[PDB]
Amino acid sequence: LMLAAQNPALQRVRPNGMSDEPQYKLEIDDEKASALGVSLADINSTVSIA
Amino acid sequence: KVNPDGSQVRLKDVADVGLGGQDYSINAQFNGSPASGIAIKLATGANALD
């Protein structure tokens, strides 16, 4: 795109489809989780249905 | 598994990990050198030359 503008032959070169958004990445701690005694199975399955 | 004495065991301590064949069975080479190949079977009704 930032080269199609620098071009005479083409005009209105847009991208179809939306662009990147901010995403909230979770990051559960496989260690502390088992420390407390919570299984990963339950932690995922719970963040799922919730 | 995390042994009670404030410690943990990871898959590294039980196995070896790495990228390898999905099926180590069938293999091939060509004129001696290590090689691979995809043999293509023609679709019933199609034209070989084409």
* Smallest Cα distance from B2 to chain A, Å: 8
| DSSP H or E segment with residue A41 | helix A40-49
Residue A39: name the closest of B5, B1, B7 by CA. Answer: B1
Instruction: Tell me whether A31 touches chain B (CB under 8 Å).
Output: yes
- Measured CA to CA, the distance from residue A15 to residue A22 in angstroms comes to 19
Q: Which chain A residues have a beta carbon less than 8 Å from that of B8?
A: 31, 34
Q: Is B39 on the interface with A (CB under 8 A)?
A: no
Bridging pattern class, strands B33-34 and B29-30: antiparallel
Distances (CA, A) of B39 to B28, B36, B46, B48: 12, 10, 16, 14
Where is B29: in which H helix or E strand? strand B29-30
Measured between alpha carbons, how far is A38 from A32 in angstroms, rounded to an integer? Answer: 9
Cα B2 → chain centroid: 32
